[PDB]
Amino acid sequence: PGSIPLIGERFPEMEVTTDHGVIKLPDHYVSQGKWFVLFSHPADATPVSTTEFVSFARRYEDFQRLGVDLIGLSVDSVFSHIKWKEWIERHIGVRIPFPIIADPQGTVARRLGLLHAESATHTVRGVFIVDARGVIRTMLYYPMELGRLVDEILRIVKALKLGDSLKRAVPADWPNNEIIGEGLIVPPPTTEDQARARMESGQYRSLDWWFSWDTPASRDDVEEARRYLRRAAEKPAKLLYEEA
Amino acid sequence: PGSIPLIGERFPEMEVTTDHGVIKLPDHYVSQGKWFVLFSHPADATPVSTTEFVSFARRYEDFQRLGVDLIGLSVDSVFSHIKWKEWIERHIGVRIPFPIIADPQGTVARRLGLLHAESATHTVRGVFIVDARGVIRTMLYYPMELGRLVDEILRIVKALKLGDSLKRAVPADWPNNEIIGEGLIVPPPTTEDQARARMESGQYRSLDWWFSWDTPASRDDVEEARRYLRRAAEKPAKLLYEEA
Amino acid sequence: PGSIPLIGERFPEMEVTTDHGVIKLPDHYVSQGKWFVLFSHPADATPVSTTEFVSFARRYEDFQRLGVDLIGLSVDSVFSHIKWKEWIERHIGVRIPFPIIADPQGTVARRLGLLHAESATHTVRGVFIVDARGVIRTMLYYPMELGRLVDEILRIVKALKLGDSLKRAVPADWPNNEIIGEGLIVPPPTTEDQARARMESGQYRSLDWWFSWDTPASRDDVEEARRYLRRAAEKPAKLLYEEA
Amino acid sequence: PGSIPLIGERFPEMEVTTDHGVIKLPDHYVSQGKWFVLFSHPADATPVSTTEFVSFARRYEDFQRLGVDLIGLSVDSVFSHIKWKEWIERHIGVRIPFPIIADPQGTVARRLGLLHAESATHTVRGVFIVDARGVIRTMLYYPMELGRLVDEILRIVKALKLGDSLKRAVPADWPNNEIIGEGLIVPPPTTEDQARARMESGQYRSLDWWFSWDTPASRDDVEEARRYLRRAAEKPAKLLYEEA
Amino acid sequence: PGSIPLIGERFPEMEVTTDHGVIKLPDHYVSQGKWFVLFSHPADATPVSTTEFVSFARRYEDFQRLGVDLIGLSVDSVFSHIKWKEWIERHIGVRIPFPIIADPQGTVARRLGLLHAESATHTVRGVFIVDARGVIRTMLYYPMELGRLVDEILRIVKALKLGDSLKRAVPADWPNNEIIGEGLIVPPPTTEDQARARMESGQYRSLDWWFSWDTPASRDDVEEARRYLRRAAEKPAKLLYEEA
Amino acid sequence: PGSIPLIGERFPEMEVTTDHGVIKLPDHYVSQGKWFVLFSHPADATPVSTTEFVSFARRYEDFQRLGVDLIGLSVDSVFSHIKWKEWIERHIGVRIPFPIIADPQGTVARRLGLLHAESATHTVRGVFIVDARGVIRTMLYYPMELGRLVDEILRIVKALKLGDSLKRAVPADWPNNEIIGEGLIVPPPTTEDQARARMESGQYRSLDWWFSWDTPASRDDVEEARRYLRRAAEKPAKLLYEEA
Amino acid sequence: PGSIPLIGERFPEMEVTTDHGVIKLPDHYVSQGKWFVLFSHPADATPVSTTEFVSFARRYEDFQRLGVDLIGLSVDSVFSHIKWKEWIERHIGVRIPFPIIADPQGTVARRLGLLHAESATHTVRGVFIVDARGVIRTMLYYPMELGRLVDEILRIVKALKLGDSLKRAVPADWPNNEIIGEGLIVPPPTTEDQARARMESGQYRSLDWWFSWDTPASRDDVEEARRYLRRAAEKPAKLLYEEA
Amino acid sequence: PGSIPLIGERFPEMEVTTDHGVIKLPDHYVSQGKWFVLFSHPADATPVSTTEFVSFARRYEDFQRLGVDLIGLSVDSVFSHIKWKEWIERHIGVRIPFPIIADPQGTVARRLGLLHAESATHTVRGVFIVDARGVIRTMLYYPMELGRLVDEILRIVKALKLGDSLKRAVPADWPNNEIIGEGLIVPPPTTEDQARARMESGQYRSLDWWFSWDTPASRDDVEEARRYLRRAAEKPAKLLYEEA
């Protein structure tokens, strides 16, 4: 087993070296009121890791529309990071606009619990979704052999921001939930008096005193979230390897 | 600030009580040749949790066809589990066929690192994807306020089984990767002699000695994985609340 | 083999979540000049536990006339508590007016020594009788298989309050003690001078210098206590299972 | 706080000195197939303690009908025990047939957790109800100022033995429970299959799948238990202080 | 300060990953009867490190003629090592024939004491000269800002092999020592009888009983060592950047 | 298996006894704006050590021209040091002008890590090159059986001083580097922005964005460094053992 | 304070390097059936130390006649020992026939408690007198500033050997004791019966039962001891500086 | 085994009981500007011990003239000390003028390391020579079976006082040294400059730069020291056992 930071904790205070410079996390993004997704990959100049960097780069403007910055992490040097980004731009025609943390002694990897039993030396494919107060909101741990689904990361941020802005919880598979569709959920009553008030009010659609919802998301918010999943589900019009 | 099991580790040996009886993990599934997805929810009779149980139940046959069983977990009693599954069948018209672990002292939750800072008393929405050798392959940690995307859990299992079987790694967003599409990746050479043997062979499509791929997945395997993503992306034709 | 609070100790300071909201013990009750009976049960929606909550609810007004508040406790959630109280009101026709502590990780159970060897996960049927100074006065530990006799909890509180106000000890089986009946005991002399002064004053009925009593309790106080024991002894006129 | 033995644990293995000789607990009783009630009192030749010894003695034949032996305990000498029993026989006309443990250094008191905060030097009024396998079934802790209700001890043993014999749980205030009267409870189902088998059965009276009961106790078993409570509730015909 | 292996100790036993595969040190070389020079550098694709790799490669056959193998070490991945060697072959026209250890978590660097104060993350320019018994013979620690003099490493190994074979010590600046030129030193007497015997022998040229020397090195051995220093001292006629 | 001071650390604060008196290191030299080379030898009146002292003394003016003081060290007494320097002057005709630390209990030797496994009693042939800020810049560890190449110690100091004043790194075998000759290296860019600026400035000759150099050293500085190596490579004109 | 070996303990087992070769103490002398005097001095080539070595060498035949070997000790090297013995032979015309331990890390000195507060680095002038069983018989600690009286070391050994061989204790200032002259002492009785038997026997001259003596030493033994003290007391006829 | 005070340490601070009263060491003597010789003996009324007390008493005026006080020590009581001193005066006719420490629990013995392996219970014959600053100057450990040579203790103190006052060291066997006679030694130079100055002055008779002496002790001071040794060497005129 291994120690990790937890959902609802402030992201561990640390200075990190990137291919853009030295920064403090989460302060660098908090002090900008920006969410960030910190993700890790095992090594530069590996193929699954390259596909994921191109996937994130292709979605960079979608992340910017949500006010989310991206930051990568591997045990490779800053020199490896610059050479690999140059390789991606020259061979795939895709610019990588976001920084990568260089973590050669595993100081950062050990602090974030990113060294699992699959490799003694290379981080797994971890994802830390961190809000503008620097709070960890979600964490994903994919293995070496499996690329992430980057549109799910966009859906998670979009849904968490919608939840925060509307005081709602977000049903499974939102905005295509099989029970309530694009509905959002009202946090259940936690007292007898709240439960009776909920039942006596006709404000919401309800299945029971503990299961109320409404549709307070804009059509734009719902369709933007659905577009992430539609993109995930679509066969590419043209494969980048062909025009490489 | 919390301990977790790690990717590549055997799932921790434990006896657990479910609403189906007492079993040993991971032995109960390993003995059946099954993968399992263990997932947790904060409390029975909460709405986002209810939507996730219904999503998993709707996908249960898709899990069974992959050789995957499901097992839930919360801090509630077995009596609470029986009452809640009865509620879902009566009010939503959906039978929950899979067991739920009852963990009222958090023994299991503390062993799997499922108590995060968001709640002192209720587990987060954790997911442990465990193979038929009992080895942890992937872990996800969703928060209280946000439902999972259950079609991503099917894509992860499908992709892992295909990668294990075909001795391949799986690109970002497979089977719709923007560079190689439904292509699967050949693990990169790790020596000078292997890198040369690779460059010399012409056996595979390559962008470089470290980036080779081919298309060994069957049309049925690719179509199956695309069907999970298309289901995630499509607005349901009928919402279950409307006949409830 | 487990730690408990002791008679004569202050009830442990703790914040607890109930189905009425968050309260501080024992302060919430000390502040109001009220005694409280904290009692635990293994799990909501279990049948002996249901019988006990109905027995307490039937006796609620008897407790209130003594200045005694009631508070329950189990490892179940607040959602379980609200659903179970609804079940009792709808099926038995009896409202449970008093709060139940929700203790899902067993934090309170462990502090109060309520996890015994009969169950790893569910509290025994514990009773803490706590006076208006927050001091533990009496503790009972009933097992899973045996419901309490709630009239004895009333008899304990009534007798303790009488003993405190009248500066007396209470005989076995009061107010029907086979030696002195409704008599209340003068604490024995603890010195030679006190013993001689007791034997020489002739203030009290005596069997010896160490065994003196009088009858200072009111006819109302004595009738109040006998009514609890008569109710315990008589077959109820009609069983609530009928009108279901 | 203080350490106690727990419900469901074997009674702690110990050699004790009594006014009858040296015995091993719980072995002495286990080997005769007897239950025992071990109770404690603060000091010989104190008045509440004397009332309780007389109450137990008066009920001695009732304990023998249940196959239950009585054993007392205090920090006093064997010599004190013999003198006090002589005093009770000579002044009250009641013989104490059962042994008392002499525990002058508090060795047994510390093992059993009977030193609470009310007295550094004398045991509280503890009660341990111990079955014929040597297992602790119930524990009561009464204070210095309050005598016990000995008829409730009889009702506890009678109810526990009936529960064991008929494989039933015992409702609140049995055999005068307000819901089900003298009915006994079928332990609730703990699995979905058991819950369905129960509800398909029509074998038992039920309020829900988790609340089933029948009336398997003999009329003799019910009326014997009601008799204990009627005696508790009766004004004594003659007070023993009159016959001095 | 920091811990290092010491002259006269066996090279610490370790399995290491190189761009040629996994080997055990020092066993991999001992089993071949080969000396090895293990040298570190801070990072792949850094300019001083590149000049050092080309300098070692240019001297590869001089090392091979002495029975000395070369092995590099940095915190970079095997992928970086393969790419960097490819760059050197393509841009400088010099193949790097010898393996490089990949040490991404600094496991080897910490064991060898190669993390100094100039960098928390990158090894200094350490050199371990290890004989065919696996014993450390000499250690050099150059900083990030200064490239090594690779001909001094050849002079060291040549001189140590001569001293071992001829049972001689090697004067300062050999083979151009200012007192004795290419002379080798007879280890000094360590007893009174040895001192007198030496002085009575006329066997060696002597400055005193403790300072004796002869000229047992071959003309070829002396000429080879003088060739290493002449190479160090001469300005290359053609610079490799011109042919690049 | 031994602690050493590290490159980039201040030289450890210590009072040392020499044959010139007590001095504080590194303060004695820092106060003078002087570098020092502290070097050790196993024992006075041993032949390799004598050749090394003569080599340093012959090069004393070269050290003085670089602003470098010399200080020796062995476990011998100050009396032994005085007698041995007199032996060198009388028999070889060379005055040793610099002090030797007397370290009979290995107090200094243990602080600098100069006791290795080759001798429990005598220091190895360690070299600490310390700048005028008292910072350790290079460390060499030569064994008992092999004399140092003193011209390499001059080349290190000269190159380090040139690197410090010109803000440059020094290639392998400078000033005879086979790629860039007497070229000095511009520290590589550590950011993407820095890399692009470098590649677009045309300010330096470059092999890639990470490998730029120029020729900022004076002809004098280059020839002075080359002279040290020419002297190392020259067959001595006449051996001092003849003149002895 | 500091730890020392003790009188009546076996001389600590140790391998030591001398200017005669490596020996085991005390085995080297035990196995020859010889006593040894191990003595220490601060530093070779110091003037008091030189006077003491000449004094021991003068008395060497006196020690050999007693069966006593001599061994010196200082923190100087074997090379220092050899050069210093040559200096004494050349300048004073006295060969030092006996070995000197070389102890440069003070390993031997620490074991024998020879490093006192007067010098952190040099031994005091210690003397261990060790018999043919390897047992320590007497220990002397002289300081740096004060040469020993070597004739008192001869007197100690002669008198210990006489005590051992005649089973006698030796009076103050033997053989010139003011009370009994060359008389030797019978150990005193230790029991009442021995005291009475000693006083009744007329066997010995006595002052009291605890003070008996006789004259068992030979004229030759007494003369040998008197000659040591006469030599100590004699103003030298010739001084060796005059022909040195 | 065994801890002792060391040469150049302050005599340990202690309060001691003597047959003259309680005194503080070393303060009692430091206050008066006196040296002291603390010496120990195994037991009062033992014969060797008695001869030594008589020898010290004979030399008492010689010790007084040097400003040296005498203090004895054994594990015997003050009562034994008084009786033994009376025995010596009555039977030998010699008054013991100096105090003896009574150390019955071995508190002082243990602090001074005077319990050796020859006896668990009785101190050896230790001697601490302590100067008027309270500093330990010399330590002697003689065994049970061997009386001290008290004239050597006088010679030590006289030579130490001369060394201190004349800033000289004292040669072996002073004042009858075979090299320099009554000469005293100039401490050797410890620097090159001091060694040169010494050689260049012609101030002192010298054998080498490290061996210089002169004759600064007075005629009276030399004759006093020679008298001690003449007395040690003199066959007694008459024996005190005879005239007694």
Q: How many CA atoms lie within 13 A of H188 on its CB side?
A: 25
Tokens of E70: 């070369």
Tokens of C18: 């109930």
Amino acid at position F138, single letter: T
Nearest CA in chain F to G83: F45
Residue D206: phi and psi, rounded to 5, are -145, 140
Closest by CA to E38, choosing from E61, E58, E2, E14, is E14
Closest by CA to A119, choosing from A56, A51, A52, A46, is A46
Upstream peptide bond of E26 is cis (omega within 30 degrees of 0): yes
Cα–Cα distance measured from residue D70 to residue D129, given in angstroms and rounded to the nearest whole number: 10
- In sequence order, which ranges of chain D are alpha helices (DSSP H)? 27-30, 47-58, 60-65, 78-92, 107-112, 150-166, 192-201, 219-233
E44's CB contacts (< 8 A; 6+ apart) are: A77, A79, A80, E74, E76, E80, E81, E83, E84
Closest by CA to D187, choosing from D198, D202, D178, D173, is D198
Question: How wide is the angle at C-alpha A154 spanned by C-alphas A139 and A82, nearest 5°?
Answer: 80
Superfamily in which the A1-145 domain is placed by CATH = Glutaredoxin (3.40.30.10)
Closest by CA to H186, choosing from H172, H174, H198, is H198
Q: How many CA atoms lie within 13 A of A215 on its CB side?
A: 12
Q: Name the E strands within chain B.
A: 2-4, 14-18, 21-25, 35-39, 68-74, 100-102, 125-130, 136-142, 184-186, 205-208, 211-214
Upstream peptide bond of F175 is cis (omega within 30 degrees of 0): yes
Query: Quick one: DSSP state of residue D236?
Result: P
Q: Do B58 and B94 form a contact (C-beta atoms < 8 A)?
A: yes
Tokens of D135: 């297992």
Cα–Cα distance measured from residue G35 to residue G29, given in angstroms and rounded to the nearest whole number: 7
Question: What residue ranges do the domains of chain E occupy?
Answer: 1-145, 146-244
Q: How many C-beta neighbours within 10 Å does residue E203 have?
A: 11
> Does the beta-carbon distance from E192 to G20 stay under 8 Å?
yes
Q: Do F143 and F125 form a contact (C-beta atoms < 8 A)?
A: yes
Place of tokens 């995307």: B149
Query: In chain A, what is the straight-line distance between the N-terminal and C-terminal CA atoms, in Å?
Result: 42
F52's CB contacts (< 8 A; 6+ apart) are: E172, F39, F41, F125, F147, F148, F150
Q: Which of residues 184-203 of F touch A (CB under 8 A)?
A: 188-193, 195
Tokens of D4: 């106690």
Torsion of CA B141, B146, B152, B157, to 10 degrees: 40
Helix (H) / strand (E) element for F21: namely strand F21-25
Q: Do C96 and D183 form a contact (C-beta atoms < 8 A)?
A: no
Q: Do G77 and G112 form a contact (C-beta atoms < 8 A)?
A: no
Chains F and A touch (3+ CB pairs under 8 A): yes
Q: How many C-beta neighbours within 10 Å does residue G12 have?
A: 15
Cα–Cα distance measured from residue A81 to residue A77, given in angstroms and rounded to the nearest whole number: 6
Place of tokens 């025609």: A93
> What b-and-e string marks burial along B177-202, b requiring 16 or more CB atoms within 10 Å of the CB?
bbbbbbbbbbbbbbbbeebeebeeee
Closest by CA to A53, choosing from A84, A27, A14, is A84
SS3 string, B69-98, reads: EEEEEECCCHHHHHHHHHHHHHHHCCCCCC
Q: How many C-beta neighbours within 10 Å does residue E224 have?
A: 18
Q: How many CA atoms lie within 13 A of H78 on its CB side?
A: 8
Distance from CA of H230 to the nearest CA of G (A): 5
Amino acid at position E162, single letter: L
Amino acid at position C156, single letter: I
Distance from CA of F7 to the nearest CA of A (A): 18
Q: To probe the interface with C, which of D80, D241, D242 has the most C CB atoms within 10 Å?
A: D241
Cα–Cα distance measured from residue A208 to residue C82, given in angstroms and rounded to the nearest whole number: 12
Cα–Cα distance measured from residue A137 to residue A35, given in angstroms and rounded to the nearest whole number: 10
Q: Is E105 on the interface with A (CB under 8 A)?
A: yes
Chains C and A touch (3+ CB pairs under 8 A): yes
CA G38 to chain centre: 8
Q: Which residues of chain B are within 8 Å of residue E85 when distances are taken between CB atoms?
A: 192
Q: Do E137 and E129 form a contact (C-beta atoms < 8 A)?
A: yes
Cα–Cα distance measured from residue C118 to residue C104, given in angstroms and rounded to the nearest whole number: 18
Q: Is G76 on the interface with E (CB under 8 A)?
A: no
Closest by CA to G61, choosing from G222, G216, G227, G176, is G227
Length, in residues, of chain F: 244
Helix (H) / strand (E) element for G88: namely helix G78-92
Tokens of D199: 């509800």
List the beta bridge partners of residue E140: E127, F140
Tell me chain B's radius of gyration from C-alpha atoms.
20
Cα–Cα distance measured from residue C72 to residue D47, given in angstroms and rounded to the nearest whole number: 35
Q: How many CA atoms lie within 13 A of C34 on its CB side?
A: 18
Cα–Cα distance measured from residue E111 to residue B35, given in angstroms and rounded to the nearest whole number: 40
Cα–Cα distance measured from residue E141 to residue G227, given in angstroms and rounded to the nearest whole number: 65
Amino acid at position G221, single letter: D
| Residue in A118, A182, A234 closest to B8 by CB | A118
Torsion of CA G102, G108, G114, G119, to 10 degrees: 60
Q: How many CA atoms lie within 13 A of B150 on its CB side?
A: 26
Amino acid at position H235, single letter: K
CATH fold of D146-244: Antioxidant, Horf6; Chain A, domain 2 (3.30.1020)
Q: Is F8 left (phi over 0), alpha (psi -120 to 50) or beta?
A: left
Q: How many CA atoms lie within 13 A of D172 on its CB side?
A: 24
Q: How far is CA E169 from CA E160, E161, F146, in A?
A: 8, 11, 6
Q: Which residues of chain E are within 8 Å of residue A43 when distances are taken between CB atoms?
A: 77, 79, 104
Closest by CA to E41, choosing from E55, E27, E25, is E55
| Residue in C75, C79, C83 closest to B104 by CB | C75
Residue G160: phi and psi, rounded to 5, are -65, -45
| Residue in G77, G106, G121 closest to F43 by CB | G77
Tokens of B178: 């923007």
Q: Is E160 on the interface with B (CB under 8 A)?
A: no
Cα–Cα distance measured from residue F40 to residue F122, given in angstroms and rounded to the nearest whole number: 10
At F106, is the secondary structure helix, strand, or coil? coil
Residue G191 buriedness (CB in 10 A; 0-12 / 13-18 / 19+): exposed
Tokens of D114: 């009977």
Cα–Cα distance measured from residue E74 to residue E17, given in angstroms and rounded to the nearest whole number: 11
> Does the beta-carbon distance from C146 to D140 stay under 8 Å?
no
Q: Is B210 on the interface with E (CB under 8 A)?
A: yes
D107's CB contacts (< 8 A; 6+ apart) are: none
Place of tokens 């026709």: C93
| Residue in G19, G79, G85 closest to E210 by CB | G79
Q: To probe the interface with G, which of F48, F110, F121, F144 has the most G CB atoms within 10 Å?
A: F121
Experimental technique behind these coordinates = X-ray
Q: Is C173 left (phi over 0), alpha (psi -120 to 50) or beta?
A: left
Tokens of C134: 């927050």
Cα–Cα distance measured from residue D183 to residue B132, given in angstroms and rounded to the nearest whole number: 49
E194's CB contacts (< 8 A; 6+ apart) are: none
Chains E and F touch (3+ CB pairs under 8 A): yes
Q: Is A45 on the interface with E (CB under 8 A)?
A: yes
Tokens of D189: 């189902």
The CA-based diameter of chain B, rounded to the nearest angstrom, is 65
Residue C135: phi and psi, rounded to 5, are -95, 135
Q: How far is CA F212 from CA B194, F200, F207, in A?
A: 32, 12, 7
Q: Is C79 on the interface with A (CB under 8 A)?
A: yes
Cα–Cα distance measured from residue D182 to residue G93, given in angstroms and rounded to the nearest whole number: 123
Residue B100: phi and psi, rounded to 5, are -125, 130
Q: Do A217 and A240 form a contact (C-beta atoms < 8 A)?
A: no
Q: Which residues of chain G are within 8 Å of residue E209 when distances are taken between CB atoms?
A: 82
